[PDB]
Paper text:
The 26S proteasome is composed of a 20S catalytic core particle (CP), to the ends of which two 19S regulatory particles (RPs) are attached. The cylindrical shape is formed by four stacked heptameric rings, with the two inner ones composed of β-subunits and two outer ones of α-subunits. The multicatalytic properties of this proteolytic machine are provided by the subunits β1, β2, and β5. All active CP subunits are initially synthesized in a precursor form with N-terminal propeptides (β1pro, β2pro, and β5pro) that are autocatalytically processed upon CP formation.
Remnants of a tryptophan- or tyrosine-containing octapeptide stemming from β2pro can be seen in proximity to the β2 active site. However, because these densities in the unsymmetrized late-PC map differed from those in the C2-symmetrized map, we analysed the sub-dataset using cryoSPARC’s 3D variability analysis and obtained two distinct conformations we named late-PC1 and late-PC2. The late-PC1 was resolved to 2.7 Å, whereas the late-PC2 was resolved to 2.3 Å without applying symmetry during 3D reconstruction. The most striking difference between the late-PC1 and late-PC2 is seen in map densities around the β2 active sites. Although the aforementioned octapeptide is located in both halves of the late-PC1 and late-PC2, another distinct density is found between β2pro and the octapeptide in both sides of the late-PC2 and just one side of the late-PC1. In addition, the two 15S halves in the late-PC1 structure are further apart from each other than in the late-PC2 structure. We conclude that late-PC1 is an earlier assembly state than late-PC2 and that the octapeptide represents β2pro remnants. Our late-PC1 and late-PC2 structures suggest that during β7-driven dimerization of two 15S half-proteasome precursor complexes, the maturation process initiates with autocatalytic activation of the β2-subunits. An unidentified density was observed in the complex with remnants of β2pro in just one half of the late-PC1 and both halves of the late-PC2. We speculate that this density might be remnants of β6′pro or β7′pro, which were cut by the active β2-subunit, as it was already suggested in previous studies.
Residue numbers in the entry:
A (entry chain F): 1 to 234
B (entry chain 5): 3 to 113, 116 to 143, 163 to 267
C (entry chain 4): 1 to 39, 41 to 78, 80, 85, 115, 118 to 276
D (entry chain B): 1 to 249
E (entry chain E): 1 to 250
F (entry chain 3): 1 to 125, 132 to 148
G (entry chain A): 2 to 242
H (entry chain G): 2 to 206, 209 to 248
The structure:
Amino acid sequence: MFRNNYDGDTVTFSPTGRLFQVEYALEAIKQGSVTVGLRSNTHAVLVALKRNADELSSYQKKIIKCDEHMGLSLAGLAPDARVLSNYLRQQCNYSSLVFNRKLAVERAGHLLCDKAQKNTQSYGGRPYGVGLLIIGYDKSGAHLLEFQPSGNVTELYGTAIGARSQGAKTYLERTLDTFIKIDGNPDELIKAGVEAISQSLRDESLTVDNLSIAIVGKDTPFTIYDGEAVAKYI
Amino acid sequence: CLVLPLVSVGNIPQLSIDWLLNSQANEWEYLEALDSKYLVEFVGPLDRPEDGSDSLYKDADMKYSSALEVFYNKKRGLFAIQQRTPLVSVNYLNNFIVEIILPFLSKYNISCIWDSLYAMEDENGVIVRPQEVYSLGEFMVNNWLHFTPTSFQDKISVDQPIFKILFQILNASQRPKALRSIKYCSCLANEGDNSLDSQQFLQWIISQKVIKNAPPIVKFVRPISWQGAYGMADARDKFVDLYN
Amino acid sequence: MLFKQWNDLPEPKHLLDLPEISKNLQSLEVCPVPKVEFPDLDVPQYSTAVITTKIMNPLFPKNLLQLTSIGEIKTTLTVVYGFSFPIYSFGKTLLFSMEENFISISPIFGNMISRSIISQLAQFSPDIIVIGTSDKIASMKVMTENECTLQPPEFITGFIGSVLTQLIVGPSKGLKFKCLVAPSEGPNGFEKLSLSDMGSLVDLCGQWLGFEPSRYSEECYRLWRCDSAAIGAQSGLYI
Amino acid sequence: MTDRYSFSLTTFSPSGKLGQIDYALTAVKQGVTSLGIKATNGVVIATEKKSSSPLAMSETLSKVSLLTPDIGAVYSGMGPDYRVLVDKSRKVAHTSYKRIYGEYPPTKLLVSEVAKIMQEATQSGGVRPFGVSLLIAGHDEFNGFSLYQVDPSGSYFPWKATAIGKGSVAAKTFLEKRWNDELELEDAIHIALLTLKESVEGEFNGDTIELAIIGDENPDLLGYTGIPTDKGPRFRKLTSQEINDRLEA
Amino acid sequence: MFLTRSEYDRGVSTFSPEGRLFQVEYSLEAIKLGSTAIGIATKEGVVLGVEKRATSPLLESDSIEKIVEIDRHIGCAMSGLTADARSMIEHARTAAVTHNLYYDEDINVESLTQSVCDLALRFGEGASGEERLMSRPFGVALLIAGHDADDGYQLFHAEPSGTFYRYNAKAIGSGSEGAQAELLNEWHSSLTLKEAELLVLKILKQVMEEKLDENNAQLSCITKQDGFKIYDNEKTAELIKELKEKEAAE
Amino acid sequence: MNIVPQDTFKSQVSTDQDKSVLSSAVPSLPDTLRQQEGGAVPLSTQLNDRHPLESTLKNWETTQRQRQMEQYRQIFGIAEPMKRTMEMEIVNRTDFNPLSTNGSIHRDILLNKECSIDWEDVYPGTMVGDDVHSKIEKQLGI
Amino acid sequence: SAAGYDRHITIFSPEGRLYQVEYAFKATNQTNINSLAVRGKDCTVVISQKKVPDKLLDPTTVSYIFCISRTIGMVVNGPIPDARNAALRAKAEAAEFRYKYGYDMPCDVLAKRMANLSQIYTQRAYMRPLGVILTFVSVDEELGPSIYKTDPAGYYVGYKATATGPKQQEITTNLENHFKKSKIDHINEESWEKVVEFAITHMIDALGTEFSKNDLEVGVATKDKFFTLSAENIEERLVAI
Amino acid sequence: TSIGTGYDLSNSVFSPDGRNFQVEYAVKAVENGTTSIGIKCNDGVVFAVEKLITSKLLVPQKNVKIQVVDRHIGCVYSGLIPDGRHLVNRGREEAASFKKLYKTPIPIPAFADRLGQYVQAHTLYNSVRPFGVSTIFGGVDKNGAHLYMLEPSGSYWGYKGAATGKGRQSAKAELEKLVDHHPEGLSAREAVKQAAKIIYLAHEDEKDFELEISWCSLSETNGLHKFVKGDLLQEAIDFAQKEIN
């Protein structure tokens, strides 16, 4: 009731000191399907469960390639996902064109945080409402980042976002020491990710239509497997 | 005396009723549920004082609360009405006065009305003294009420619901004979979080001794529903990406 | 954005923008009340009645069940308003579906319709199941006449609120009931649900109606995704 | 975008009145009294000085301002708006007239420029109207002496004698009973002093009232000699000693 | 615990407590107010069919244009506000012609659909970071049917949210629910062109209040060799008569 | 830190470079009728044979203002130029007077030109256009 | 209070007032400290009260006296953020005046400039006034010792002497009585140290209960320089009568 | 009254008492953040943060709660994470620009003034929001050691000891006691031990926590900002645990 008076826009604090529009934007992530990311000292992988409108429709794209050494997966709104993926592509292209340099994953996370913070303190727009998982390989090795649209970025060994992602996150926490040491064997890491995302399923089974995988590594350019390319991992 | 709050700006009267029914929970018990034909219907749990006192609902097999409830205080002999929802339309206000409130007054042989006004909507200039906050009256434009010199108003607009309530009470062809006087307390305020505003309004009403039987309140207690006024009680800790 | 308009001061929110029965706001008389007429039918012939709104239509597939129309409840108000309230039956179960609309239909019609339905059903004490939505609850709720799972300040309003009020404090107290409530957002007649809430609704409704899980869930899923009003922009806005 | 505009701050009430202009007029009516008297040989403009504290130096702040050597002005209302409008009028006298025709503008045209500036503030999306009223006295070759009053809405009228401020009605009546077509400048000064005597609650001396005249040319105020055709300023502000001497007499 | 009024559904840039944008939902509701359009994609071409709602018999029959030609290989059907669809169609035509000018080739159907969706995003931040262009989302939905060498015959659904889907069969408009149920029941991957046309006519007849004839319904198809064409009234009338005879056979 | 304005020449041209006056029949070409410039003025003629001092005079005050903002940034911080620019933008955006072209009093106070006159002040200065609606469309962006 | 609008922006009320301006005026007494300004024969002295209730604060960083130019000093009554904003803008104004007109900015001209900016804030809807009161002191090369005060309403005026704060009335009355007794609009002393001691004595007898060297701040303007005194200088002044 | 109805829905609005309620609501948002303290010793500063433990999935070296604005300037903040990151970025930009222009590290008071002006500019218009963070920053320059605290209103002050967050009352009481017990001054190592003790004592809320400490001293770190190695951190933790139990 009292929250109803102080949640008009992002330039208003409640009398208790709460910014409710940003909290609602954060809550918007739960409306998207689950994505899992993980990595070892050599490779980083993303696993995504895709959804279709109905039987006659296609499945949504959950994994987007940014550059030959970096990519991401989405959970949340579609427009903000499109905007942020295009922005990251532009930043990687600028780095390559101007410096002949590969954009670092940490730099991409910082740029995303800077762009996301702006919409949460000025009137006339809205905060973003998408969580992102960013995998990459650079001069410091393999990297996985979690971006929250409040303007936050965290570096983790593994994580999951989306609806009912708590089970996958718990599984990743329990078995950290196992997949943290899978070096030089992409298949084992991908299977560990698939098993992790299997914990978040509810009355659902992974198929060749609703499963998407992505991998990046030292000698592996960022590659996306869809359809029959994931049939071996089921 | 029967206390009838009105659904007005800031929900200040209703909130005040909560204070009155939780700061002195010992003297108050749930009495009756009135008909809610002209209100938006409401079903919910039973509210209790925050400090841990016993619920005003003494019956053990009742687990639900309706939109319009009447509580009674036998030690002071005071009747209070808690209304959860506004009227379906203003047109039915007359019905609400004629077929609901007046039968109760006649049935219990009751021998005030709490309200708030928004200054920006004062299209008839009834606010003659903006310096003061409250107004107390006792019994186009109407002059049927005698407001104290310290009140912010001396008349009431015909657009206000209080005029319709007064007209229905006075012009009733079979109004109860036991009804003697009418008291009308109103305050000027602005929308927002009006818990402290309601507390101050109740303090002013009690200090002015508008109701003789009303005892002073020293320790104010909220119900437990107010803890959910900003959503989940422990929601702030959930957003680890925002607060640190 | 250099500024925000000075004159965009919000209106006080203690007023609900509900439709007005009559244009004359200065009237001193008593506004007329809608008259409700309830149908010929054999109430004892049915051992169960289901009271809900149109948003729960996917929970009752037509071909899978034996949903057949039996009559219409007639509500008329003259100040002239007229409406029809069809009643369906499948097996030995009744079904009263209410078409809420916060723009066109006043809550007074819902109040009177609920009163008439409860008055007619109280003469035989059948099995009563209430399915509805609320914007004030955090998760799905199952309630009965003996236990209320709501915590303050959660509550239920609307037509389902009218039905529960009639069943609890009306002139027909004591009728046992089961109430299933799902979280929702949006004005009355335009609510929306989450996919998980839709699945939970399907599962619990199937369990309470005694149907096989797999086929019922398939049919309900297909009806939910077939451009139902409660799934408006879920697929196209969230990925 | 929703910031490419801003709604009008001054709108018509249902009765047909612009509320902000009326409230500015009320603010003017709460101000200190000022007056002007038009004679055959000059115009007198007078006002009452006020001070927040006795420790203030009343000579630093002057309610009487020279717009041109032959045009001066006085006020009733809010001081900062006065300062802004006086600076603008002094600039406009040069940009619009003296840089074009080589001569200072007549009284009526400068009044018209000021009134246009004030009117543009009542049809805006982000400034309130000026809450001030103006008295402008002047002289020009083809029109003689003139006295004008300008309102917050931007309307201006010529007066034989007038007053604005808190004591405006009584002062207007007193001037109505004490004006004629054959008055002289000294008689006008005496009448102005008598009229101001009825409005000042405190000390009525030379350090609490302010007077200025549009009279004859003052070649001693030019600052240079040698050109017989160069006329001195006709605007002259009376000193406190002169006001005291006139009050004693 | 009191019933007050919520106001989170009035601004396009305001979140609900659960993270929803209700102006997009209301734009979809505006879409549902329009007439019905059905698209069916097969291996021999894509069929589009629309219902013409004529409020008055004085309205010109050849005036309702719910089916337009974006390009020789791309056609479109619209449902919702026609004024917004006009701008969307102009943008799509410009994009196709510009792609031909700069690349000397036909544009992919998916690329054109993506461009239209990027335009539809313009009520907020643009896909390339552009400033906001319009004050509200569009109130139209599009069915885009095309053929290209990379992916064959494709049918896409474009919505005001900026998201498009690929469909085997899709219905939009007022009678979209029953039509979509019929499409779910009656679509298979081995349909021919004439069977698709007959199915479109049957579903339109099922979901239309007025009696279906050549004046309140319109058919069109896109094929690789003949491009995009809209059937005249005689061909559609012959198809309707054949459908009636087939129905009366049983 | 520029004294004389620099980088005043165009680097690209197009037939749709003037968004205000574009043909509705051919949106890629300008509208000659609504330009109201004599009808025989191609854009190319504006690229050559200009007076050398014209660009210096047209951009002088903006250049001095930018130098002042740069000095404030160097000596005071980001906040000072940010606040000055915000004030000026608010004042300029809230003013809409289609019947007059004079600058406001508050703009002159912010620019510190209350008692200053230049030739722009002395010299402030058809069939189609020059009406209120054209200014409304240009101001609102519609 | 404001009924409808006038609670956010500066437009006229039905009574012809600007409530936001008056509220900005009331905002000037938040710090609950007082300041006094007096003129000597060839110096101008400003004395401000220091209150440091917190023991964790660094006292040397607490100050409401600012140096604007070589000859002008300023004292601010009100919250310190708006005070620092005003101080920076005044520094910029004085420097720009010197650049544009070839000679140093006088105190009264700077006061008029700040007052004109305040008028802008009082008339524009999307701008708020600064809840501070500014007092400029100098020894002008033409006008001699000078004290000029500006307020949130855009009003400015010069003073023989002035006082501002929650207890300004008592100091004003004491100064008025002293100037009645002496019949001179300044202080007849040849050194600024005696003027500082006189101002300290006036402050002590007006406020009461006296103070130590750490509760005071003193700024002195001469014909060449405005300078703020340190704690040891104030201690010497307190000791020396 | 803490809640000003009718004057708390816009940023740049004065209440009838002359108060700005949106800034106060930002202050209340600050008061719910994690506890942070700063202590000024004889020749430097020490910062201490009560970090809350998280999942093991976090990379241990990539999540630090003490930010380095520059080689001689370190800061911590309590409130909103994005606001703190934004203010740290602005501070880094200001320090870099000053060092480029004047070929010397920026003095602490100049940095404090620039940051304070930037914060204060966000209380002037209704199209922005006050920062929901309070910052404790400091370092060493040619004049010595400086420690400052900056609030959402743009108000900043220099401190002998500063505390912010949920456990601000107990931390402030302990800092006052430490200042009283050492009229002469304090050393860097004693400051580190006392910072660990104060962070441990201030904690009162079933949840395990860790501690971060940071130094900047002339004698210990050559006037540079450094973190705490294993040995000193372990010693300070042992001292704090002895203090608690």
